[PDB]
Enzyme design. Sequence first.
Site, PDB file in Angstrom:
ATOM      1  N   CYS A   1       0.714  -1.282   0.040  1.00  0.00           N
ATOM      2  CA  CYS A   1       0.043   0.001  -0.075  1.00  0.00           C
ATOM      3  C   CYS A   1       0.799   1.351   0.058  1.00  0.00           C
ATOM      4  CB  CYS A   1      -0.791   0.062   1.241  1.00  0.00           C
ATOM      5  SG  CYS A   1      -1.164  -1.635   1.932  1.00  0.00           S
TER       6      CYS A   1
ATOM      7  N   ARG B   1       6.927 -11.323   6.270  1.00  0.00           N
ATOM      8  CA  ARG B   1       6.508 -10.873   7.741  1.00  0.00           C
ATOM      9  C   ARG B   1       7.246 -11.792   8.920  1.00  0.00           C
ATOM     10  NH1 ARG B   1       0.846  -9.722   7.741  1.00  0.00           N
ATOM     11  NH2 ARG B   1       0.453  -8.546   5.643  1.00  0.00           N
TER      12      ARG B   1
ATOM     13  N   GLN C   1       1.507 -11.455  -2.813  1.00  0.00           N
ATOM     14  CA  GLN C   1      -0.171 -11.044  -2.826  1.00  0.00           C
ATOM     15  C   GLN C   1      -0.673 -10.497  -4.229  1.00  0.00           C
ATOM     16  OE1 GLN C   1      -0.636  -7.876  -0.062  1.00  0.00           O
ATOM     17  NE2 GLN C   1      -2.152  -9.136   1.066  1.00  0.00           N
TER      18      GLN C   1
ATOM     19  N   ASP D   1      -2.249  -8.148  -5.205  1.00  0.00           N
ATOM     20  CA  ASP D   1      -2.687  -6.920  -4.367  1.00  0.00           C
ATOM     21  C   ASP D   1      -3.208  -6.067  -5.444  1.00  0.00           C
ATOM     22  OD1 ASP D   1      -3.094  -5.364  -2.343  1.00  0.00           O
ATOM     23  OD2 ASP D   1      -0.808  -5.058  -1.788  1.00  0.00           O
TER      24      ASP D   1
ATOM     25  N   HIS E   1      -4.663  -1.259  -5.130  1.00  0.00           N
ATOM     26  CA  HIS E   1      -5.083  -0.305  -4.370  1.00  0.00           C
ATOM     27  C   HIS E   1      -5.983   0.583  -5.358  1.00  0.00           C
ATOM     28  CE1 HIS E   1      -2.089  -2.053  -1.865  1.00  0.00           C
ATOM     29  NE2 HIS E   1      -2.896  -1.727  -0.884  1.00  0.00           N
TER      30      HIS E   1
ATOM     31  N   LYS F   1     -14.928  -3.569   6.022  1.00  0.00           N
ATOM     32  CA  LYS F   1     -14.255  -4.480   4.923  1.00  0.00           C
ATOM     33  C   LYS F   1     -15.230  -5.438   4.732  1.00  0.00           C
ATOM     34  CE  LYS F   1     -11.789  -6.822   8.644  1.00  0.00           C
ATOM     35  NZ  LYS F   1     -10.759  -7.795   9.078  1.00  0.00           N
TER      36      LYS F   1
ATOM     37  N   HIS G   1      -8.149  -1.375  -0.579  1.00  0.00           N
ATOM     38  CA  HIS G   1      -7.209  -2.512  -0.346  1.00  0.00           C
ATOM     39  C   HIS G   1      -8.055  -3.833  -1.045  1.00  0.00           C
ATOM     40  CE1 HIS G   1      -4.500  -0.500   2.404  1.00  0.00           C
ATOM     41  NE2 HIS G   1      -5.742   0.273   2.840  1.00  0.00           N
TER      42      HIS G   1
HETATM   43  C1  LIG Z   1      -4.982  -6.442   0.245  1.00  0.00           C
HETATM   44  C2  LIG Z   1      -3.892  -5.583   0.547  1.00  0.00           C
HETATM   45  O1  LIG Z   1      -3.856  -4.372  -0.064  1.00  0.00           O
HETATM   46  C3  LIG Z   1      -3.700  -5.307   2.321  1.00  0.00           C
HETATM   47  N1  LIG Z   1      -2.862  -4.399   2.361  1.00  0.00           N
HETATM   48  C4  LIG Z   1      -3.549  -6.680   2.846  1.00  0.00           C
HETATM   49  O2  LIG Z   1      -2.524  -7.004   2.931  1.00  0.00           O
HETATM   50  N2  LIG Z   1      -4.594  -7.133   3.549  1.00  0.00           N
HETATM   51  C5  LIG Z   1      -4.720  -8.422   4.603  1.00  0.00           C
HETATM   52  C6  LIG Z   1      -5.551  -8.304   5.522  1.00  0.00           C
HETATM   53  N3  LIG Z   1      -5.356  -7.103   6.349  1.00  0.00           N
HETATM   54  C7  LIG Z   1      -4.748  -7.073   7.755  1.00  0.00           C
HETATM   55  O3  LIG Z   1      -4.204  -8.237   8.084  1.00  0.00           O
HETATM   56  C8  LIG Z   1      -4.934  -5.769   8.247  1.00  0.00           C
HETATM   57  C9  LIG Z   1      -4.326  -5.887   9.688  1.00  0.00           C
HETATM   58  N4  LIG Z   1      -3.023  -6.283   9.685  1.00  0.00           N
HETATM   59  C10 LIG Z   1      -2.231  -7.511  10.127  1.00  0.00           C
HETATM   60  N5  LIG Z   1      -1.035  -7.847  10.052  1.00  0.00           N
HETATM   61  C11 LIG Z   1      -0.103  -6.896   9.790  1.00  0.00           C
HETATM   62  C12 LIG Z   1       0.963  -7.125   9.847  1.00  0.00           C
HETATM   63  C13 LIG Z   1       2.149  -6.219   9.579  1.00  0.00           C
HETATM   64 BR1  LIG Z   1       4.208  -6.615   9.663  1.00  0.00          BR
HETATM   65  C14 LIG Z   1       1.843  -4.890   9.052  1.00  0.00           C
HETATM   66 CL1  LIG Z   1       2.848  -3.653   8.748  1.00  0.00          CL
HETATM   67  C15 LIG Z   1       0.505  -4.781   9.060  1.00  0.00           C
HETATM   68  C16 LIG Z   1      -0.599  -5.506   9.391  1.00  0.00           C
HETATM   69  C17 LIG Z   1      -1.910  -5.104   9.445  1.00  0.00           C
HETATM   70  O4  LIG Z   1      -2.460  -4.153   9.008  1.00  0.00           O
HETATM   71  C18 LIG Z   1      -4.598  -9.620   3.904  1.00  0.00           C
HETATM   72  C19 LIG Z   1      -5.752  -9.489   2.692  1.00  0.00           C
HETATM   73  C20 LIG Z   1      -6.086 -10.821   1.912  1.00  0.00           C
HETATM   74  C21 LIG Z   1      -5.122 -11.862   2.293  1.00  0.00           C
HETATM   75  C22 LIG Z   1      -4.157 -11.912   2.994  1.00  0.00           C
HETATM   76  C23 LIG Z   1      -3.357 -13.093   3.137  1.00  0.00           C
HETATM   77  C24 LIG Z   1      -3.737 -14.468   3.623  1.00  0.00           C
HETATM   78  C25 LIG Z   1      -3.109 -15.366   3.552  1.00  0.00           C
HETATM   79  C26 LIG Z   1      -1.558 -15.122   3.726  1.00  0.00           C
HETATM   80  C27 LIG Z   1      -1.143 -14.049   3.429  1.00  0.00           C
HETATM   81  C28 LIG Z   1      -1.668 -13.011   3.199  1.00  0.00           C
HETATM   82  C29 LIG Z   1      -3.828 -10.565   3.820  1.00  0.00           C
HETATM   83 ZN   LIG Z   2      -3.197  -2.458   1.052  1.00  0.00          ZN
END
Ligand SMILES: C[C@@H](O)[C@H](N)C(=O)N[C@@H](CNC(=O)CCn1cnc2cc(Br)c(Cl)cc2c1=O)c1cccc(-c2ccccc2)c1
Ligand SMILES: [Zn+2]
Lengths: 400, 401
Positions: free
Chosen positions: A93, A122, A140, A142, A144, A224, A270
Amino acid sequence: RDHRKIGKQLDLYHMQEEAPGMVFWHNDGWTIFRELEVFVRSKLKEYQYQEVKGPFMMDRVLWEKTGHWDNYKDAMFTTSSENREYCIKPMNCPGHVQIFNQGLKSYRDLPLRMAEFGSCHRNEPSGALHGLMRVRGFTQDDAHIFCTEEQIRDEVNACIRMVYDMYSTFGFEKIVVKLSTRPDKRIGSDEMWDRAEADLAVALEENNIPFEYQLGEGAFYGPKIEFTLYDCLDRAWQCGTVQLDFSLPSRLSASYVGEDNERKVPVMIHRAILGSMERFIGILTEEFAGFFPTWLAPVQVVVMNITDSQSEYVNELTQKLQNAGIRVKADLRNEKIGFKIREHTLRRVPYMLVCGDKEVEAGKVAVRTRRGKDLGSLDVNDVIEKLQQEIRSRSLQQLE
Amino acid sequence: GRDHRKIGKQLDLYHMQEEAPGMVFWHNDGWTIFRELEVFVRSKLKEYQYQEVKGPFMMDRVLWEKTGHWDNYKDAMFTTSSENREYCIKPMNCPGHVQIFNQGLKSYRDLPLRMAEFGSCHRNEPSGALHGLMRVRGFTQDDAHIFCTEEQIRDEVNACIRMVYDMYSTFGFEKIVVKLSTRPDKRIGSDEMWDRAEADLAVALEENNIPFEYQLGEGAFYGPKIEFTLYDCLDRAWQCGTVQLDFSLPSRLSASYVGEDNERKVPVMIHRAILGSMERFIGILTEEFAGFFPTWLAPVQVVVMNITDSQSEYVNELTQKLQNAGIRVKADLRNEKIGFKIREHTLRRVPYMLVCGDKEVEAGKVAVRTRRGKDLGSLDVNDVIEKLQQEIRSRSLQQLE
Ligand SMILES: C[C@@H](O)[C@H](N)C(=O)N[C@@H](CNC(=O)CCn1cnc2cc(Br)c(Cl)cc2c1=O)c1cccc(-c2ccccc2)c1
Ligand SMILES: [Zn+2]
Ligand SMILES: C[C@@H](O)[C@H](N)C(=O)N[C@@H](CNC(=O)CCn1cnc2cc(Br)c(Cl)cc2c1=O)c1cccc(-c2ccccc2)c1
Ligand SMILES: [Zn+2]
């Protein structure tokens, strides 16, 4: 249906303790990954997305402005150079906002849809890592979307369509949908959340999608939608997310010149549909038990001779399939036809094209499926045309 | 002027900023060029019978200590930590390729094993020394490692040389300078092993009638090397390609195969990159063409436009037909003068501008203008599509004349 067992058996990937939760993709595994990328790219084009690539690391100072540092620094890999600290990107993002901030943006540029196969890292607990499902390094699918408040419903509508479109390709039709509403601690007015939740709700309604609330489970910065698909074993996999963000653009000084000539902060959406490409390959491996649909198969066709006599017919047919853009190998080994079929069946090769004297003499080929079915002897050009169609259509069903 | 920095901004290819020194943000049109370059390399990987793999972004310092790189280059490495364990962000792909090789029993029948990767490399280079796409911290290597027997070295070096000139010739680079670097004072292995290794590089070059100069004593501890320096249209030298023999790393990282005698043998490693840094090569190409990319590399290959609103449906139809033909095409139906539209697309370096008047619609034809300003006249739609397909698939440096 263990992706870790099947992964070793079909030489797709491996893991080592020298790199916990980070995948070594072998030739055949990387072939599946790349075909999945090609598929998602076709949808990016079909749904009017740009595709970008961001750097692996950015100044911690930038990540501090996102608010993520204070809450998730323990889950972030950091590295220093010349008294500056850099975070290895856990999310795409902030990088996407950096690209948005290059050049003056107009309301005319919105909605701006920016996709990436985003390499994320991570610092997950080593003890909790599991194959392709729980990793430290993932890719991802991904994107935006930068848009106006008025464009949210239409853009979320398009995201929902894309979700069901992409899941249907892999044979996932049972989808559970959950809308997460305003938490106790949140930014913006109660009015903003009323409109934001309503936008997600109407978008699902416009697509005739029934859903349920996860009350108070929304993020600080917006509501969401989460999409949970069910595999053939009826196991739940949360993959798809559509997340409204009324925070990050402001935090990273994102703006556009409105039609009223006033500077405005874009709304950010997102969304990931597959989620983790690695995890989704894991789910598909278990869903198909290694019997990947032809379009995904590392090797789609093996052409094989019964005796030495059909070697040159096999070579001609293998070249024809190569020219047709099919992933083909010739099995010209001095082995029983039974031995060849058994080996390539165990390797989950969709089609085995058997050439005996009868086939060569008639300009035909005998088609065997990895499911052990004999489709009989068919015209070469008709088989090639049919294999091309099955591959182009990304069909789940083999030839009849 | 042909500054890749200026063209990169003007054509919205990429940007760089202080929050990520020497690391590139690829914008839509720049990432299109990057991916087409990848597609090209992959076509060669298939032709020259290479596997393609992907390795982890980071690996334990313990493994990088085994390579010997830690002692020599620890200051040029990015490091990160997790659970009291130190990890290096990979500056090279060779150790990862060995890790994949070491998975599964290998025999002499598996050699030569040619393992390619678009390898994400990071080097902790001084920030003051960085400039444009040319000197960076984060780059992508068109990398490969060949695991082979002593006997196979000469043939594999031969194929590497053919691949180098094959790729350089595609981009119109015919001025290549070649340097063979021989045994240094501190080296591994016998004088006899170096005799054979140096001869394999020399004879491979001589048989290909490649004039080269020796860099006597400048070879690596672990084997000799060939380096290829290409020259752009400004006669500026760019060292891009390397073929490096390595009789050290396979032993260091416990690489072995079952010989024909059923005894365990250490494989010879050949390191080879041709473009070098994909980012740098795009920079070199941007300047070489001054943003006038050959049609196959052009972010937008064709723009179709109307003279009035009468031809707007015919333009949309032609636009879809070109898309179905596999061409990166856009419609321009805006209410702007033809002279305004053609100027915008010429500035953006669109190879072909297809114009549809009433005469074109009626005849099932299209007027074809080149970005250089040559009018090729009103031509049959299917004749034009087939001509454009051939130019793109052949990766021609030149446009229709
Ligand atoms: C779609 C992207 O543009 C968005 N930025 C994003 O990554 N969203 C997360 C779901 N969102 C969250 O998880 C938000 C809470 N969260 C959790 N862990 C974090 C860990 C780190 Br190290 C940082 Cl910097 C931020 C966060 C955070 O905001 C998301 C959405 C869909 C699938 C997955 C996913 C599923 C399985 C494995 C890996 C990833 C993760
Ligand atoms: Zn994002
Ligand atoms: C082809 C690959 O398989 C091989 N591993 C490799 O990367 N070779 C180097 C040239 N080799 C060297 O430069 C050897 C000496 N050296 C120098 N700096 C290092 C820095 C680090 Br941080 C580490 Cl770990 C090792 C080294 C190292 O061995 C190489 C070859 C061709 C183009 C380029 C290149 C050219 C322009 C920009 C970036 C890269 C680099
Ligand atoms: Zn190497």
